[PDB]
């Protein structure tokens, strides 16, 4: 029923509830943010809201505030008509928390009061209910909706005509009957999704054409309740309640596939535990479907040769942006000669299938230990793969069809444009794919472009003179191998990644989202549990919001008023339960004193290998230590202990010792105790979790709880109700009576495992796991926490196979290991202050392990909660990361210019040498001329520079032209290569009267700026001393009337420039510093005919002698010297120019 | 009996599945070898195994999956290939003429337009490898290869095809031809085809589209049967290197990969059964409906300025099938009190 917004004309918008701290917490940053970025600029606030402070509570207030907004600008734009509706998301990982939080927005909206009375009248609230919608999945969206809607949709769309939709639905219909059973629950789940899928199809198919029914009134309702996100499409909700992988993948409507990530603008995106997020994110980006290069490109090369867009309106300018690529693919098939299919040479390439590994910037590992070929064989018409290079050729395949669905990308925009002007950018995005995939007949790409377009259309570049960072490119990886069921035939099956869960994250709130990510530890310093702040805070800047102190010190405040543990005797207590292997040893004795040999047989009898029995000792040690301190306890009743490993019937034999010493102690002390054995997130989701309530409601005693610290992620809140008749007085409230409307505790006693287990994996695919892997090592590299050697190594491993083991061997010598372990133990102990009911005294035990990581935690603690302060004192009490963490990114800055360097001189060195090349190239030496330090780290040449501890300059050791993996920086090379001022003796270059004044009217730096960020030794060595050296010598020759000219793309790079001079015809070149050398006099001389060269030393000694060189390098008469040598045109001691240099070398012209 | 309906829906997926990997791992190096309970276990499993390890010759089985086959450990076996000296006791014989109509009138619609551009852009270029394995094949799809070129030229497939007619736009272009003599059309008026190099596009409105759908159907039709003798060819070059369905399988696979033609792996599977089964469509040959057939091609929208050629084809009639059955070499008693009807 449409309950007109009308009822909110007198409503007064003015009156609002009192805000508690959080709530101005909230505001005062997007006010502020309205302010400094204006309204149409999106923004990231984390918030660091801890456990039971209710950070639920104020994120549904303040969902609530907006809608309220969006009603009174609805109210006030009816006069203009220009309904700018703004949708509200409140995203998250579990289902069980989307379907809480609107349970929780639509009781607030109930029974939200303001001085005593009712916010909203019945009808008011009616209104706002109808404007929240919940898109679950399609299996449970098609099986919530009734028998009755469901035959009203088929009836009113005619559905009910085709005999397998009938069937289909009948056979759903009935499985509900029986779905009690839980065989049956499965298989109607995946009943149910299949055929709500075809349905949307085929309603989809029916609305696209001209039969297009008329929805309304039962009809209608019935739709929007088969599909919710209908309601969102008519305005009739702005509020959506989804997941993660729901918001991503998108939902259905009466007409077509919505995706939130292609319609941010002025989106407000409420997501619950945000940290979390960059692993459901990497999931769903690692679940990519594969693709073949080859046969990609070749389907590419040939549809395009040909096929064309029609000259209608809406492709005007489409045309232009495939042009470069259709260039690009003939260049490519001519190159590769595509005519032929490919194979493999070599009983190795038969024997395993090759694997080959890019981060696309400067990583590259392949498993075959030779360097893999790739040559044409015209009398066998093949491509021979046999041990050009093939990482070459998968590299810039890569590039052409990443290439090609970005100028899809574009050329749907482009259509979208037109269209427009011709008389809704996601139902034309449908309409603008289609029409440009049939035209040129690649009707195959149209999945690729699909799934692309959400994830990377949100989109700086993969060059130097951009801001480079794996989290734009992401990476790839290649299997080569054999077609199925051809044995002469390979296929390229690239996977890409071509963005992380941070990069997704900048993109939409560059897309102008506004997200508030309220987690307790939202900002965890790592990259691997959480998205990347560092990279954040680089691309957003001002829009990545942030609480100031005395922000975080309200919240500091509001925390201990709710939480006063100091005021209500509430007493945290600590154990950092060390091995005992006594003890251990007496308990298995006293467990089977049969065994006369204690140790092997009785381990045998746990089924301990004998390499594992002194870890299975040690930590079966702390944790029954820990057990036994807990039951001592008089008063403590519930534990919960998180372990490594999950005890299911795998561990069958030492979850019966643990019982017989459950069992002995609860006998000795007179309590009883339970045990929950195998308590994953299945099992206490299902029937475990009521179990445990009932027994700590109904019965006294004590209860332990065995879990992990993945299963208690994804679990229910580890309360429950509070009998007082059996509790009494042991209980202590630590919040204010007003807020304790149902009495509730949680645990009072935990034992804490120390986390190992820290590395993320994808159990979708192998692929998927492979490439969450190299995600995560080309993470811990862009963060600066692992060498480029380390990382490579670490990859090349990744790919050999690695062992789970060994990844996560590898992973701790990380200090981001320690931050994950840090962030999984602080979230462990903030399940125990969820509720306001507390034990006098609370029990803390924790593996020894974790004192030392724990006693090295440093960040501010106003924000941490009780039991993690607590934790934290106990372990400094016993008595880095940003200087190895410098080090690293120093070689990581040099090895990515090293290699991009070379890359992009091998480019200038094609023939035909691009103008973008030609033009980032001098990009590149203008930026190094004018800023050759910089106070801040740039965004878009960051990688020419390094963070140098010292300002202005740097030590080094390295080769620039072997290794990048083998460079070391600072204080690890005292006595070493200076990156300096002093080193190119600027300074003294400045000193000549010509020079100055051209580097002055240039812009360029005469002095170095004593700043932190220096130029990398790859650029200070190859690309400054000899950008200096051209300048100085086109400044001194220019001042003798000379002039100069750009050499010609077919020799650029090989020489500085051309200059002509008054009474000279032939060409003259010239060569700056500051037989390979023979091959390129020959170059030149063959197609421009004959020249005078100039080779020239802009700084030296003048006292040398002019030496006149023929072709050979070989001294000669000046009249037959082709070459002419000026060993110093500028005195190199006092800066004077060399004018005798400059008569000699205008003799030398006027000779011809 | 609802439970049943779908346990067989989520069975027969699941069946398709298991049998599918099955295959895979046989197909690699590392196959499965099958003897004692895993063998006979397998066996049970796939009745067709027992027919490819020769454990079994005699088969019961419906005359739907007689035409369609039936899977075994290694691949899927069709009878209909394997027909030389195969005896065979059709009940209710002349009840099979309308089975095997029923099956041949499932086969999956193909797009012209998009089938023909997609052969012309691959032909034009792409090429065999000169290995014993395509020895004399390439010159097979010599001739296949000038007529893509001559076709397309006369044709200018570099442009997509729309309507420009409000008739054609209003009311969807049915086009029926039994390739012979009989063709009708759904349109009133006679449909042209018109390249408009200005607007880049051809343009149906109101050369003809019949001739265009015509000669587009006998390059598709052509191109099948070229596959076909392709891979009798390459089974023919196989054999000389040091049986029929196995090397059938890998002769397919690496044809359409050299060609960059993968796409058409589904259609040229359907086509062996029903037409490698096997004279030709010109006067000077044995001329009958019962062995060419029919062809229905729908002209709609894909977007709204884009057209598709949806043609559905006949190519043998039931009669043609059990003709070409008889002359495979099978010995056919069709028992029926009426066989002769």
Redesign the interface.
């Known amino acids: 029923m449409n309950v007109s917004i009308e009822e909110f004309t007198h409503f007064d918008f003015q009156l609002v509830p009192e805000p508690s701290p959080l709530d101005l917490v909230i505001t005062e940053p997007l006010k502020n943010h309205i302010e400094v970025n204006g309204v149409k600029s999106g923004a990231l606030l984390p918030l660091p809201f801890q456990t039971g402070i209710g950070k639920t509570y104020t994120a549904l207030n303040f969902l609530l505030q907006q809608m309220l907004e969006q009603v009174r600008s609805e109210l006030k734009e009816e006069n203009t008509g220009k309904k700018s509706k703004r949708l509200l998301y409140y995203v998250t990982d579990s289902v069980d928390n989307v379907v809480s939080a609107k349970a929780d927005l639509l009781k607030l909206i109930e029974k939200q009061t303001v001085k005593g009375e009712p916010r909203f009248t019945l009808e008011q609230q009616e209104y706002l209910k109808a404007q929240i919608v919940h898109l679950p999945n399609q299996s449970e969206q098609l099986l919530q909706c009734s028998d009755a809607v469901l035959n009203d949709v088929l009836i009113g769309f005619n559905l009910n005509a085709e005999r397998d939709v009938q069937?289909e639905w009948?056979?759903?219909s009935?499985?509900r009957r029986?779905a009690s059973n839980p065989e049956?629950k499965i298989?109607?789940n995946?009943?149910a999704g299949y055929f709500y899928r075809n349905l949307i199809d085929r309603l989809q198919k029916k609305q696209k054409g001209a039969d297009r029914v008329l929805l309304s009134g039962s009809l209608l309702a019935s739709v929007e309740t088969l599909l919710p996100g209908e309601k969102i499409r008519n305005g009739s909700a702005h509020v959506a309640f989804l997941t993660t992988s729901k918001f991503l993948k998108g939902f259905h409507n009466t007409r077509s596939r919505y995706s939130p990530l292609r319609d941010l603008s002025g989106a407000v995106l409420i997501i619950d535990e945000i940290d979390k997020q960059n692993q459901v994110i990497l999931s769903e980006l690692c679940k990519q479907q594969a693709q073949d290069l080859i046969?990609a490109i070749?389907?590419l090369?040939?549809?395009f040769?040909?096929?064309?867009?029609?000259?209608?309106p809406?492709y005007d300018k489409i045309e232009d942006l495939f042009e470069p690529l259709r260039e690009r693919l003939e260049e490519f098939?001519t190159n590769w000669n595509?005519?032929?299919?490919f194979?493999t040479e070599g009983a190795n390439l038969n024997e395993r299938p090759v694997r080959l590994f890019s981060d696309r910037s400067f990583t590259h590992v392949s498993s075959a230990t030779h360097k893999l070929s790739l040559k044409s064989d015209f009398?066998?018409?093949?491509n021979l793969i046999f041990s050009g290079l093939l990482t070459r050729f998968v590299n810039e395949a890569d590039v052409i069809y990443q290439w090609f669905l970005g100028t899809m990308r574009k050329a749907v925009f482009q259509y979208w444009e037109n269209v427009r002007g011709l008389e809704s950018l996601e139902g034309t995005f449908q309409?603008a794919v289609?029409?440009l995939l049939?035209?040129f007949?690649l009707?195959?790409f149209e999945s690729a472009v699909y799934e692309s377009f959400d994830t990377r259309g949100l989109r700086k570049a993969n060059k130097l003179s951009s801001s480079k960072s794996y989290h734009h490119t992401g990476l790839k990886l290649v299997e080569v191998a054999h077609?199925?069921?051809?044995?002469?035939?390979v296929n390229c099956k690239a996977s890409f990644l071509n963005t992380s869960p941070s990069g997704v994250l900048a993109d939409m709130v560059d897309a102008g989202a506004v997200i508030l990510g309220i987690s307790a530890t939202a900002r965890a310093d790592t990259v691997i549990h959480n998205f990347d702040f560092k990279y954040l805070n680089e691309r957003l800047g001002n829009k990545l919001l942030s609480l100031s102190r005395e922000q975080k010190q309200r919240v500091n405040n509001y925390y201990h008023s709710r939480r006063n543990y100091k005021d209500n005797g509430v007493v945290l207590t600590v154990k950092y339960l060390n091995s005992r292997d006594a003890f251990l040893d007496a308990l298995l004795e006293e467990y089977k004193p049969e065994a006369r040999s204690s140790h092997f047989i009785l381990n045998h009898y746990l089924g301990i290998a004998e390499s594992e029995q002194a870890f299975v000792r040690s930590w079966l040690s702390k944790l029954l230590a820990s057990i036994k301190a807990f039951i001592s306890s008089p008063d403590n009743r519930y534990m919960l202990s998180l372990l490594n490993r999950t005890l299911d019937t795998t561990r069958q034999n030492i979850n019966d010792f643990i019982q017989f010493c459950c069992d002995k102690w609860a006998k000795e002390f007179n309590v009883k105790t339970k045990t929950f054995f195998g308590v994953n997130a299945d099992w206490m989701r299902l029937v475990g979790y009521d179990e445990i309530s009932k027994h700590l409601n109904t019965e006294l005693g004590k209860v332990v709880v065995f879990s992990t610290y993945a299963s208690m992620g994804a679990g229910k809140n580890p309360d429950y109700a509070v009998n007082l008749a059996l509790e009494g007085e042991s209980l202590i409230s630590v919040a204010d009576v007003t807020y304790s409307t149902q009495l509730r505790s949680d645990i009072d006693s935990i034992y804490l495992e120390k986390p190992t287990q820290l590395l993320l994996s994808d159990d979708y695919s192998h692929t998927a796991n492979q490439l969450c892997q190299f995600h995560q090592i080309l993470s811990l590299q862009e963060n600066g926490e692992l060498s480029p050697k380390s990382a490579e190594n670490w990859c090349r491993q990744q790919l050999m196979g690695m062992s789970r083991e060994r990844s996560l061997q590898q992973y701790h010598q990380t200090s981001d290991y320690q931050s994950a372990v840090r962030k999984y133990i602080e979230q462990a102990v903030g399940r125990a202050g969820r509720t306001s009911l507390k034990r006098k005294q609370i029990l803390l035990f924790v593996d020894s392990g974790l004192k030392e990581i724990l006693a090295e935690e440093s960040r501010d603690p106003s924000l941490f909660s009780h039991e993690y302060v607590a934790l934290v004192n106990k372990a400094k009490s016993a008595g880095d990361r940003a200087v190895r963490r410098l080090f690293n990114l120093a070689q990581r800055n040099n090895k990515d210019g090293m290699l991009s360097i070379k890359a992009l001189v091998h480019r200038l060195h094609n023939q035909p040498a691009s103008k973008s090349d030609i033009q980032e190239w001098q990009d590149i030496r203008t930026q190094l001329l004018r800023y050759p330090t910089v106070a801040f780290q740039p965004e878009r040449f960051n990688r020419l520079y390094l963070q140098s501890m010292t300002k202005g300059y740097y030590r080094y050791q390295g080769n620039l032209d072997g290794d990048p993996n083998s460079f070391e920086f600072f204080d690890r090379v005292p006595y070493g290569d200076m990156v300096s001022e002093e080193d190119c003796s600027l300074a003294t270059l400045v000193q000549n009267q010509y020079v100055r004044p051209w580097f002055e009217r240039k812009g360029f730096a005469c002095s170095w700026q004593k700043e932190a960020n220096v130029m990398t030794p790859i650029m200070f060595t190859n690309i400054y001393k000899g950008a200096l050296g051209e300048q100085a010598v086109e400044a001194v020759l220019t001042a003798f009337d000379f002039t100069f000219e750009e050499v010609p793309n077919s020799i650029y790079e090989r020489f500085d420039n051309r200059v002509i001079f008054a009474g000279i015809e032939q060409p003259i070149w010239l060569d700056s510093k500051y037989e390979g050398y023979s091959s390129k006099i020959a170059l030149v001389e063959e197609e421009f005919g004959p020249s005078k060269f100039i080779y020239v030393n802009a700084l030296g000694d003048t006292s040398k002698p002019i030496r006149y060189l023929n072709s050979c390098f070989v001294e000669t008469s000046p009249q037959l010297a082709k070459v002419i040598e000026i060993p110093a045109l500028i005195d190199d001691s006092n800066a004077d120019t060399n004018r005798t240099a400059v008569q000699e070398l205008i003799k030398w012209l006027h000779h011809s």
Not at 305 to 312: A, F, G, I, K
Not at 338 to 341: D, N, T, W
Not at 483 to 489: A, F, I, K, L, S
Request: proline letters at 0%; glycine letters at 6%; hydrophobic letters at 25%.
């Open positions: 069937a009948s056979a759903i009935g499985l029986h049956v298989s109607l995946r009943q046969w070749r389907t090369r040939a549809n040769r040909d096929h064309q867009l029609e000259s209608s809406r098939g595509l005519a032929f299919a194979n009398l066998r018409r093949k309409e289609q029409s049939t035209h007949n009707q195959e077609n199925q069921g051809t044995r002469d035939t």
